[PDB]
């Protein structure tokens, strides 16, 4: 598109001079500071226009400011970049909130509708309000008699989480205090708070309770709603499904798990068709359906065993995840006995060349061995310098392999393998792991020449194997 | 699942590219064979222009030896289809049963070397490598190697010149030459020497390469064209475009493959010269070799390979910045025009798009380096464009003129050899080339090359006739992101080119419907972070560059602390300074505040005249030095270990230009 809303559209074009007057003459106005050239605003324009059309019915105005024309206006508001969706309320030019949600007509409309309403809505009868309007975000209700300090902290949280949730206050003298959360997915089931009344008055306790219990039991995960699960801090259990039928097949078990494991970890459903590469990002192969548990706190991925690529290609029947297997994996992870999955290629069982191809699974095991001295080269297949080093590395590995069998020479593909506890600020990075029970790893800094590498291994090697003479002894023959 | 880029969808795209290549190849076999190429629109062979010798444009490429089949050999090998590769090898043997190219054709040494010899050598390596899925074994008998050796023997007499530099053209059966043509053949000929064990090819071509490099000027920039007998440069113009690209490409690639330190040093010096003089924010402009001043206002399409070359060299950020410009050019024209003016259709001097693979190559290498689905989307759109606009009755036809949209009636061999190959590899994540080999080096024509360790040792033994590093991640990549493309979301300057060159980026008539590749709604709605997918305010300040011809030697890799340290400042140093005026937008998109001018000393402690002048309106800021764009709040210090007028140093030790301090430039 052209990034500029059509004249016939509800959008209002605001110039430098006319901006202040329009802002002062209208209560709530969402202003977009865009630029016709860069395409973020171009993709913004259609959904923005649709949102403006929808909002005009509710009297909320949407405006467009072209920074290319109204330069001074744009600097005056300290615009960082385009598109910058800023909200002006109470005819206040100085005050300008920043829009944060997704750039979709539905998201913008919901955000503006929420901005129009007060932070906390006071309703005489809760059921009438609940039935009157459908909700797209969780509803937190402080029903019953409200303590002054709890009232203050509740309103403070509502101001803090204005965009995250919608807060409702239905005070009844007779009925006892009852804080609750209404998940849009299950409006019938409220998440009543069972803890003591004193601590919840604390801002931190209420924040934690919301961050934990304000998530759908088995909702559909996506980049937009990812921040909600990240903030909770619990481990996230993904379910990849190929089609809606598969999701309906797996929904009962995963809903039961999410309800049972509430407060420990979060379970979500991710559309494999839409997000298959996320499976790779989870250190799991793209073989769906697929259950993977991610621990964002420690950055440890745990998942069910997956068929090998050759077996997967031969396989012609749809993959099925056993419910017992899923439950066992969840239990093991919660207990902590489950072992993580490290980003790694298939173990190089067949080693034709002397250089021992290391994968993430066997890396730490191989280097940590005290019986041998290991010289791991960390390389990326695309980097030229590692390719340049490969011949010399092969010659050195051949020289050591037939000589004393005490120095192991290996390399690991860092792009395809993640090694934890090793600092790789670039490629190539040659790290010597000296033998012995306790021996700090040594990084190679010199020119990566054959003699230089031999001298490095001899000097910094525990076993002090002189490679260069061994190379010469082989050279004479 | 559109633009989701799962493994299954990538397999589907890979199959589509495979089918496209087979369509083109089978059409060539049915119609063009036994001639060099098949005209796609007219479905007739494109025979060598025997009648008109003067037509060197067509005769040079076409020697009438089924060049399309030979070039497609390597593409078939990469497809990992053993039956098809065996059939093609047998067809090549049948076309040349005697094992020699006894064809009366006056042909260009460089192009033939890169295409026929390169393809034959790579195909022989594939056939004789048991690991490769296209291994021939008993069926193969070294025929491809013998044919390559015969062609090399026929081409070598070109190097029997007074200076050892090859003649531009030669007749295999029996004046001006660009540096790329003079030097590049050495890569293929050295591979041939290793395989056969004959040193003569490597010696002669390597000597020619060394002479060509020695012809560079004091700035370490090489004029594109030269006269081998007189050794006089015809054009002071130089750059990374056509006629010089393969020289740098093969300098780096030969350094990598042959483990040659001299070649690596040559590459380092040449690349530093390019960054210092030619490099700009979004492309390597073409500058005069002697002075380093801009020569022409256009950048040719052949230079799109440099993003992949830089990915090989380890500079991800420069490669990304350079590749974005050609992405924008494709968005504007639907096809990268031969030449395009960045400073003002009439903008394009040469506007035909022969379907060159350089953009495809850069996209493939950048995807391999970054694994960013941004480049996967670029490849998907390129495939769609091929099918919808370039596909013809009997092949793929490029634009004869992007301004009008006319399609030329010609399928160049490099189309099948490189464009389809790179597209397939970009979509073939499981290909053996990058999954298993991990040491292959693509030639300039996209022919994989690798010297087996036994061959290397045999060649070294039987002769008879700090270091570099790679950047782990691009700068723009922030933390880890699973949901969104870092290029779309986190590259703030993604669309800066649209505004900066809006004058010269004019969509032709047929381009009106086409949307920007990165802005495809299906791709954008999936691979864009709403939190960070934000434009950047363009700089309203004045930006100018000055040249520092300080004596000494040039430091190839100045050390980075957010500071660049220059132990030596010898040679020309292109410094891109930014004028700072109150209440203006700087290079980094921030609003200049009065605090910037607070505590400013305009007095020269090394002189007296400037003191009276000092006794402000604007300041000076350095944003890029020698082509190295500084980061936000980026300082620069130069070790002392001046005469030039207008230069001064203050108490804070910041160099003054026009008695105006440079806030971030220091002289320690
Ligand atoms: C229903 C309606 O028109 N309401 C408008 C309101 O949108 C506007 O902000 C205000 C001040 O001009 O005047 C009211 O009459
Ligand atoms: C009982 C009740 O709702 N009291 C609220 C109080 O919590 C809030 O801080 C104040 C500001 O709007 O408004 C009062 O009506
Ligand atoms: C000059 C000419 O046309 N030569 C052709 C040659 O291109 C072709 O490969 C061969 C196979 O039949 O037949 C020759 O006559
Ligand atoms: Ca090329």
Residue numbers in the entry:
A (entry chain B): 24 to 500
B (entry chain A): 23 to 196, 209 to 378, 396 to 516, 575 to 670, 673 to 726, 730 to 755, 770 to 796
Question: What did the publication describing this PDB structure actually write?
Answer:
In Saccharomyces cerevisiae, the glycan of these proteins is trimmed by the luminal mannosidase Mnl1 (Htm1) to generate a degradation signal. Curiously, Mnl1 forms a permanent complex with protein disulfide isomerase (Pdi1), a redox enzyme found in all eukaryotic cells. Here, we show that the Mnl1–Pdi1 complex initiates ERAD-L by performing two crucial reactions on glycoprotein substrates, trimming the glycan and reducing disulfide bonds. Pdi1 contains four thioredoxin-like (Trx) domains (a, b, b′ and a′), with a and a′ containing redox-active CGHC motifs.
A cryo-EM structure of the Mnl1–Pdi1 complex was obtained from a particle class after three-dimensional (3D) classification and refinement and had an overall resolution of 3.0 Å. Mnl1 consists of a canonical mannosidase domain (MHD; amino acids 29–514), a loop interacting with Pdi1 (residues 515–650) and the CTD (residues 651–796). The MHD forms a barrel with a central pore. The Mnl1 loop interacts with domains a, b′ and a′. The total interaction surface is fairly large (2,480 Å2).
